[model samples]
Target chain A: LSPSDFLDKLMGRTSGYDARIRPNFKGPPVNVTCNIFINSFGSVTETTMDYRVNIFLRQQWNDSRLAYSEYPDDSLDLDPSMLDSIWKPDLFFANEKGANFHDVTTDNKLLRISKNGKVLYSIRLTLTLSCPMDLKNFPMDVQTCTMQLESFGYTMNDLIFEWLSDGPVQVAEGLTLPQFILKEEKELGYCTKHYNTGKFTCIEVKFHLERQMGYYLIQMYIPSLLIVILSWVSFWINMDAAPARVALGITTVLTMTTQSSGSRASLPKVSYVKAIDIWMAVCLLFVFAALLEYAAVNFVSRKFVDRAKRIDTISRAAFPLAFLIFNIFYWITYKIIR
Target chain B: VPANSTSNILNRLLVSYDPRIRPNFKGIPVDVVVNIFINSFGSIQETTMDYRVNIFLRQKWNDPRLKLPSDFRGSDALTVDPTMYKCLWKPDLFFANEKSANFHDVTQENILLFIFRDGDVLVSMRLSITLSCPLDLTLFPMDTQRCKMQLESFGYTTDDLRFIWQSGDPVQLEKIALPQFDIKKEDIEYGNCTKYYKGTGYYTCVEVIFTLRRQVGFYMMGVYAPTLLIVVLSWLSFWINPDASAARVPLGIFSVLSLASECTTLAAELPKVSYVKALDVWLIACLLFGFASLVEYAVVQVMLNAAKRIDLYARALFPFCFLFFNVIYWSIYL
Candidate 1:
């Protein structure tokens, strides 16, 4: 047949394959499988973690386009341009909107038709999705993300989407997350939603992300701890070395505060304090308290030298003991609660 | 009179043809121009700058399908909705740097299509786009950032759709700029990129870049200046007599607490970085100077009679040492 005659018949202008008719299969489900390649995963904002993923969707339909004979130049493997007039599944990323599809800009949508009237549609596109982020235990927080694929207009009675394997979601080798480490990834069972119009079939894939906290511990916690300890030097200096002792107290107080501030600079200014905040506050208090202890010693020594030395001697052991106890309490509480 | 008759006939002839056929123009280089009015710039993050920009993109091309014979009767040009025509090629442009968060095409419902009897077609669209600019903050509060907004064709290459920046400066900024940033430099240029798909070679693409800087006044007043004063105040404690516990004790304690509070406030504005910043070193130095004054008194308190000699030397030494510290610190950092 000539190309124009075939096009006219295929479009149902004459007697042939009707474009209006939905493809019908006798039994068994239309198997669908998908693969995702992570392009980039970042923008871990306070409320959301954004990711760019490239999804490949393959759909199998029982109705075949090869049933109608084509011109000698046209093969059973039709050009994707011709399929623009043919039937395609109303498939979509149920989790995202405003996704850019490859079909819109590229003319390379591949299609294949079997002699028995089986058809396969392959689509590939990149999508950016935002998942809700839980930052309560941020820096050491773990995040869970879900991606769903389902039919846009078609009902479950018309098409049933399922994973290719009886097992779980698959991950490509050499997948590396920038800010987080992948802990667990799996496919949840099919979910059927009943709407006013019809029922929709959906399959979901969930990713569990564990945040890397080594960055925070080294950059913030260690330096602040040292600064607080540096404040203790004032306690050991001879009371007679008044200038040296005062300098140590004042310098440590200021430096410890600076170190604490440095640690908090990168995080969002949330209303409630974080584990890091409690740690910093305690460190600043320890350093500040050491300086205050001196003020008391300096006051007493003017009248009673023996009493002032006794107070200073007692504090040398007492201050470190208090700090050690506070550290134990702070860690145990935050670790269990979070 | 001859020109008017020719124009009328040309317009009349254009109405006789169907626009469904692909235009037969050879090497059709579509001239694309843009004018952007920055509506607002908000949500300035450490890594990205989010801007609400209203852009007018104009595309001009020649189409043989729209040509007219001079003998026909009508106006020289016709304006219609572009949707009425089919098989018309569009540049399919997209923003290269857009983060696509809360992305919306806020183009008006009605767009303009000006078709001349000579087959020249001009299509214009006014788009309100929310775009994210990837920004570098190495210098942070003291840093000047150059943010970019780039436009490129998605599918077509240099061969299929040739993009030319409109003559003069195509981008026009609204007089009101981003609140925190000042436009230090803005530039527009034609950038060519060759893309290959499978074995087929597509054409070229073009883009525009803009540069701007963050104002430093806010950080100076809020952070640096106050911290400096507290450091100088702490030094006054060194001049007080060491034996005067009432004066000496309070001076040391008060300055330490004051500087500590300032540090906490400064922490809120900055990001936690592994490397030390210029500000970090300066703040630490000032704190040491304040502490040195108190330490000098402690030495005099212990030496007793030597107190007079130490105080006299420190009076001259402290300021000189601080000056030396400043020279070394600023020279290496700023």
Candidate 2:
């Protein structure tokens, strides 16, 4: 309420002006409950996760300013626009992506003062929080995001902040996160610090995320496997058909290069190699090895034709089996051990 | 100007009086200047750099309400802490790309105030900030990057608050440059700011652009020159007798397989950019040369008698063709 509106209301009532002076509640111990709602999650970078979260702060305080049964209607729901008139605990995000706050509707900011001096201040605002993400595991990684809430100015002895649920934080119903699956959600207990005046309290919430590998499997791994297999087809073809065999080998090798380049475009240009690089490198090696094998087979064909036929026959099985073994070992080593 | 020690002068003064309530001088502008004293340049990552800079924000406002009489020597300046007087206005300045890191207020007693006598305020603080930069890797190892450090007001628009670079060059590189990159150029550009029409209002930004180049000597010797020699080695296969499969075949095979391995190893070091890089083109061309030599040997096997003549012609023909291809490759890609 504006100062002019407060003065106008004051002039209308003078019989019991003392009750309208201040709130009847004690100065300290305002029990506050917080509700967090995850709206959307996107722009997942190597070091940061861009997300929008809505925080709901519910506080109950006693206001001796207005007495019950004094008016015709004993109930009064204050407009959120008048929030500036009442005393409110300063709440702010300790870790925010930018200095700005997300837009909120005027109607959403509401206050309800009861006849018995019970004042409930409810507010909701969205914030784009910056979560320092670790992507060492990359496509097969798990990320845990945190949202920390604390009083910007008020101390713990003055205002008490608490979580609404004892079990887990409440993610909005039917909320589905993109690119990642929500594994777990936890609410840590109030952490209070002793300062010169009183104790400062902070509440924290953690959200765990497990990456889904469907996109990577289709985009990078499957196409690379097919390209490798295409080069192997040259081995089974009649060696005398030099044009067909050579053409197939060259085409597969060139196509593999294009595919490898295509897969890397979406990721960050970091100096260090990721696990995906190992997969691409090994796949490229296997395809080029098939081409190199044909060169060796053709070399032997000149002098030892019979020996060349035996080598080709053995390689028809040996090449595929060797690749299978390499794949098994490579996956087990990188994924399981290191 | 010494003042008489009265009974109690401290009790007479109002420390909580907010000077911001008074209006600015009618037609005069509040000239604001900032001086950035860089302490150290930290890690320069792929898309961001950590920087520790001490900024001095100085502004002079002619507020008649804050001016004190020359004779009143009771206090030269009434220093008020932010906690005592929360109603006073301070410039809502913030780092543009400060992800989640908080700027440490290193001022003693957690106090931020202005000198009331002259109506001039100077706010100084050191911020360890991590700024995000969009990197362009076209030239890559031989490329120069321009990263910008922008500072803007959070709530004030152009009409209400105007931020100007502190005369001359805005940034003062007090500390030495980062070891990995050479500081090539530093320029200041102003006026293109944020357009926030809602709460916290529009902001005016000042950008300090930094041009940096990666040291190319490491990449030249480590990757480029060695690959060039390997490609040149692949050309020698044409001089060998086609029938001497033992010498020619291993030469072709060894170079081809090793080139493939080298290309893979190099690719592992760089990010998976989608575009074909100059390095990729060079590696592919070299791999093709090796693969073609093996293919040439296969073709010569069919022409048993003409194989020697073909090998002799290729000794000259192959070098000429490769030289021409190199000219075209370097001219276009480089």
Candidate 3:
């Protein structure tokens, strides 16, 4: 009998030896190393605080009973073998909300055996992982979201999981997120989580994500910053042009209000102050203070229009100086904070 | 003697035996092979610089006196009672860096002794030990330490008993939970640690070294990022109107206190070493940046009329000064 055919009968034993039973059942726990190749990642939502990912999860373990070193090649292509007929690690994502294992092109799976009886199994999965946000630095935050995998049934006594030593994570070179920078992946090592029954082996991969500033800079910051400048433009109007100054100040201040809510529509309803909240509040204050200067100009007197002219003229230096001072520092503060 | 008489004859085999004598093959040393199967490893402690581990320590060797009868072929190996184990000779190996150790005894003592017909013997026991590992924390969270587990003869020198790791692979380590460190189990380093104690000769010592790489995300997210924002927070005064004593004075003083308190919070977790660490240097520079920014505001208030010009020059000066210092700092530490 051929070596290929020999392994099947020896492994399956034609109902004599059940494949459902694991190899070396009474022996030490099987050490499985897992690696991930991220095909793409996207839809990282701040409102829902979850991210979607498509990945190829690769797992490998050794079974001494499956050794075929006498074969001519370094490894055997056993992709045609029935995967369900063999005993494999019962793995599930601990941080997962939903998952879809692909079925196109013959299950999109790979199975092979090495010269040392090491079995390699690879499968594709699309899943969502929950990420809790700390909004104190929102829009300027560096979030470290993780994908933790654990054995659903087997304890640490039967299965030990680990990340591959030689770079367990790989990414598509052209991968890009709409609102985030694809900061590299990190291996968090293995852990043992205890349950009511026993301790289960687990491991995690942390995908470092940095929020893109250019998105918010274009959408909300630049527009609100311009409205503040537009409100200050009213300070240049003649003190006698009351309708022109009042209308300009009121329109720009209301426009700043619209921009603040527009930015918040995409974020969670968290009570904590964020970097975005600081900018919005600062811009609104400046716009509100611009209209207050007009009130000070009118409060002088009905006949004392010359004193009103002097107060309006002094407003030019004060507003511009305070605006420049706050801007230069606010940019430095938020940019470096995260 | 046959199988039935084998037990009867074995009961009187230790009449002229001495457990202290080495089972030498002619004049050569008795070779002993060790295979360690690890159950689990406790977390590596940064402050104590030590770790705890449990293992099934197996040893294999041969003795000329343990030869069984030629007709006793029913069972190739015989299981000796734990009470009878004292009648036989065994290896006297000990871990060189062991601080504390204990044998497992839940129901019965976790031990095994198998005697083979051709004078071969195998003994295994469940042993847990706490061993010291001196570390260099100059790099702190960015550091990687290589700690060694050494096994050496306590009494027998190299001439009496030689110990070696089993062929192919000697260690079987289980992936266990560890906080703040990552271990590459397959990438474990093996070496020799023979010691020549001044007057006495060299002793046979074998070593298994584990490389523990520290996780930096804890310090990076918690300590560095907060203090970094504090430095940029003080820089806010450069943009604040110097004439407004109400706003700028309170802002500058508050930034200074934030930096000081952040340093105090970080020091609680680390050892109070006299020598400088990477984190110490990082925090000191951050505190200085806050201090200097506040000092610049103070100098501007004294200048009175030139306060506008002083603030203008500072807007560009402090940011560049910080960026330049950061370039030099990262290159040295990273």
The candidate that wins on TM-score is 1
Best by DockQ: 2
Of the candidates numbered 1 and 3, which has the greater DockQ value?
A: 1
Docking verdict class for candidate 3: incorrect
Interface RMSD of each: 7.4, 10.3, 16.0
| Alpha carbon lDDT of each predicted model | 0.58, 0.58, 0.70
DockQ by candidate, in order: 0.06, 0.07, 0.01
lDDT of 1: 0.58
lDDT of 1 by residue, B1-334 (tens): 6444543433333333322112432245445544344444555655324565555556677766556565445787766544442234444555534544222233533355677867777766555555554444445565555555555554333444556666665666556556677764343333544433221135344555556667767867776777667666766766666555446645655555565555545544544443445565566666566667666665676567378788788878887888898788656545
Clashing pairs in 2: A1-A82, A23-A64, A24-A64, A264-B272
Docking class of 1: incorrect
Model 3 has a clash total of 1
Off by over 4 Å in 2: A1-32, A42-49, A54-77, A98-107, A112-120, A151-162, A165-168, A187-201, A330-338, B1-334
Per-residue lDDT value at B212 in model 2:
69
TM-score of chain B, per candidate? Answer: 0.72, 0.74, 0.88
Tens-place lDDT digits, model 3, residues A179-257: 7887765637555665322476889777777877887788888998888888888888986676787778767865775
